[PDB]
């Protein structure tokens, strides 16, 4: 069974990488660009960007270990450990030339260690809508004068005693609807069918658990990045962020300036946290233009 | 049918206040002390202190509206609205003399507006283990370098879409056990018997919902406290706080110095958030001493 519809002209395939069976969707010709999804989604969040990049590139969009149709990692869930899997997978399809990287949400957490360790392997970099794990996330507020913050799930998911799985299992459709819509500026792009598909994928028990292990590894990722961040990023990089309810706002480019020297940023008005879905037309253009220069 | 065992020499009774049937446990002779419990608990959290205070005082411990055996409020759940019920309840037993007030957790939120507005009625004040609702609560972090913070529940409880009720229904004991133990330094005082008593009580649907309405009203309470705090507290006051994992630490006294003229503070080493249960002997000593001078 496929969990999501493949864009016509693309292939759904699997590939073993350090003993872990990873799922990906591949298509196109030319240099390799990897699109890495985040939490509450799968490779499918790139389905509108994929057919356009495929006219100029070979496009691969994997499912993070344990999510979508990929097996869980065998090492661990910290960024360094997961970045190992994504790097080798990408190197399997572009072993001789550098590749491009687009990452979103916790897709950033699971690639930054690979980028900083193999700068030569990464030609261009696009990061959208996520902090890189570092001490700054320890300052996001738990509660606001506007009501619930959008980052309290950090602690909820990270909690011991399997608190989040115990409360959410059997209620994924309800919880995921609230989680996605509260971080979105444009909620109506999340149709009843798309939420059902994502909820079905995340209700696989190993996937609900894998989801939260990423957050349970977050403190490790922060400790990892404190050393890794001693090397700044050399390649051209672009940040994208939503400027509406739920978007990263100015924070995305500001933090990136501490990691990268050659960075340009865009804040998309009226867009929240799920840019590929909420603002596909403006977002794709910026990605296609940046990756084609 | 009583939800908790009444101590020898005390009576469980009811009293209508502004149309609301309030539950309370009363005992002793002499001047009145009112003990006001907090979230996840009932009057019963005071059951060790009550027979000791009753040697010198008339002791009353009510259930907050909507929690324990008290009916929900008819007006609202903001501090100013709840304070009306607690003030009028107490004055029905001490209409001619001022009375003393000991409050814990959201017991502070629901008494500070009464204290500030009727200062002649409050002889002495003991506050323990809770911030007064004001702009500082907007600075507590969502996530820490130590892992799950102890305040992410502010947003969880205040969330729209009935998020907390839906996620916790059918898992009340499980949630309450994690909530209490993660805020405690001394977990062994929370027996399975005690946790069931509290779990059953707040699992009543109107009590589970009332619990979250306090947090849902917090932003209103902050705006209310912004006006009230222009009048500083003139009565003698004492703050108690735990110095171990889960306690308020030095924050308790520091915030109170902005509200009160005459305040002395204590931080109890090795104690978390639940002082009456975790550190009864030291906490009772300080309270009985303070109210007796």
């Amino acid at each position: 069974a496929e969990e999501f519809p493949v864009p016509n002209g693309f292939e759904s395939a699997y590939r073993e990488v350090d003993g872990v069976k990873l799922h990906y969707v591949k298509g196109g010709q030319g240099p390799l660009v990897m699109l890495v999804h985040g939490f509450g989604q799968t490779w499918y969040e790139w389905h509108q960007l994929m057919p356009e990049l495929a006219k100029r590139f070979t496009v691969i969009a994997p499912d993070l270990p344990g999510l979508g149709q990929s097996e869980p990692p065998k090492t661990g869930y910290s960024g360094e450990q997961v970045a190992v899997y994504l790097h080798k997978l990408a190197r399997q399809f572009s072993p001789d030339r550098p590749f491009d990287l687009v990452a979103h949400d916790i897709g950033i957490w699971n690639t930054y260690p690979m980028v900083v360790k193999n700068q030569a392997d990464i030609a261009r970099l696009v990061y959208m809508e996520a902090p890189i794990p570092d001490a700054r996330i320890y300052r996001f507020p738990a509660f606001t004068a506007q009501g619930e913050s959008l980052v309290w799930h950090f602690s909820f998911f990270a909690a011991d005693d399997r608190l989040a799985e115990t409360l959410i299992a059997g209620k994924e459709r309800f919880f995921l609807e609230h989680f996605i819509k509260s971080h979105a500026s444009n909620t109506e792009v999340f149709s009843e069918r798309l939420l059902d598909l994502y909820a079905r994928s995340y209700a696989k028990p190993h996937s609900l658990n894998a989801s939260f292990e990423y957050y349970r590894a977050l403190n490790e990722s922060v400790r990892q990045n404190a050393e890794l961040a001693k090397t700044r990023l050399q390649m051209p990089t672009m940040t994208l962020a939503g400027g509406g309810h739920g978007g990263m706002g100015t924070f995305q480019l500001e933090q990136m300036k501490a990691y990268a020297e050659d960075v340009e940023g865009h804040v998309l008005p009226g867009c929240g946290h799920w840019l590929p879905e909420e603002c596909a037309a403006p977002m794709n253009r910026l990605v296609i233009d940046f990756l084609s220069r | 049918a009583e939800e908790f065992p009444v101590p020898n020499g005390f009576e469980s009774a009811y009293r209508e206040v502004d149309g609301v049937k309030l539950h309370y446990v009363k005992g002793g002779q002499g001047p009145l002390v009112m003990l006001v419990h907090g979230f996840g608990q009932t009057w019963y959290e005071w059951h060790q202190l009550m027979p000791e205070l009753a040697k010198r005082f008339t002791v009353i411990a009510p259930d907050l509206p909507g929690l324990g055996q008290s009916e929900p409020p008819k007006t609202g759940y903001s501090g100013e609205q709840v304070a009306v019920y607690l003030h009028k309840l107490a004055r029905q037993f001490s209409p001619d003399r001022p009375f003393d007030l000991v409050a814990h957790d959201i017991g502070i939120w629901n008494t500070y507006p009464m204290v500030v507005k009727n200062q002649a009625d409050i002889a002495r004040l003991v506050y323990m283990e809770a911030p007064i609702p004001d702009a500082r609560i907007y600075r507590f972090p969502a996530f820490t370098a130590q892992g799950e913070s102890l305040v992410w529940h502010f947003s969880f409880f205040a969330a729209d879409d009935r998020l907390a009720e839906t996620l916790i229904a059918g898992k009340e004991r499980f949630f309450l056990e994690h909530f209490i133990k993660s805020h405690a330094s001394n977990t062994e005082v929370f027996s399975e018997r005690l946790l069931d008593l509290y779990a059953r009580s707040y699992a009543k649907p109107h009590s589970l919902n009332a619990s979250f309405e306090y947090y849902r009203a917090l932003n209103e309470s902050v705006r209310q406290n912004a006006e009230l705090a222009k009048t500083r507290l003139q009565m003698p006051t004492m703050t108690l706080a735990g110095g171990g994992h889960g306690g308020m630490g030095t924050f308790q006294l520091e915030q109170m110095k902005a509200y009160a003229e005459d305040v002395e503070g204590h931080v109890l080493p090795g104690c978390g958030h639940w002082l009456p249960e975790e550190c009864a002997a030291p906490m009772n000593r300080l309270v009985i001493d303070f109210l007796s001078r």
């Epitope: 506007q146 500026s185 939503g242 509406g244 309810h245 706002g249 100015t250 924070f251 | -």
Partner: nanobody, 110 residues
Framework: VQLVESGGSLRLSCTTS????????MGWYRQAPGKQRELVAS???????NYADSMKGRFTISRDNARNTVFLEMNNLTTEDTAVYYC??????????????WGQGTQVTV
């Protein structure tokens, strides 16, 4: 993000250059020439409304998502209510930063 107020019993309106749904909270505030700025009414993106005391009964806040427009309906006005009335759009970012945008304000004289 840009707010355009208009108007100034009476009904006030404010339009946003972005979707009203991309705005966490919409609020009306008023200010007398020498007094503190005070809240009139709020409406969150999900529909919850908040009114300041002694504002209920005379005011009604509402929106029109097709028009990207928020309305302030003022009834049984009194000299005690004349001010410059401002609409505020507050945007809650993922990080918890709140950025505020204000309309050019419109004068109400009674």
């Amino acid at each position: 993000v840009q707010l355009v107020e208009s108007g100034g019993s009476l009904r006030l309106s404010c339009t946003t250059s972005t979707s009203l749904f991309s705005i966490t909270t919409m609020g009306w505030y008023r200010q007398a020439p020498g007094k503190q700025r005070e809240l009139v009414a709020s409406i969150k993106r999900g529909g919850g409304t908040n009114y300041a005391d002694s504002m209920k009964g005379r005011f009604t806040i509402s929106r029109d998502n097709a028009r990207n427009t928020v309305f302030l309906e003022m009834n049984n006005l009194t000299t005690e209510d004349t001010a410059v009335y401002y609409c505020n759009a507050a945007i809650l970012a993922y990080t918890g930063e709140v950025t505020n945008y204000w309309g050019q304000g419109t004068q109400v004289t009674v």
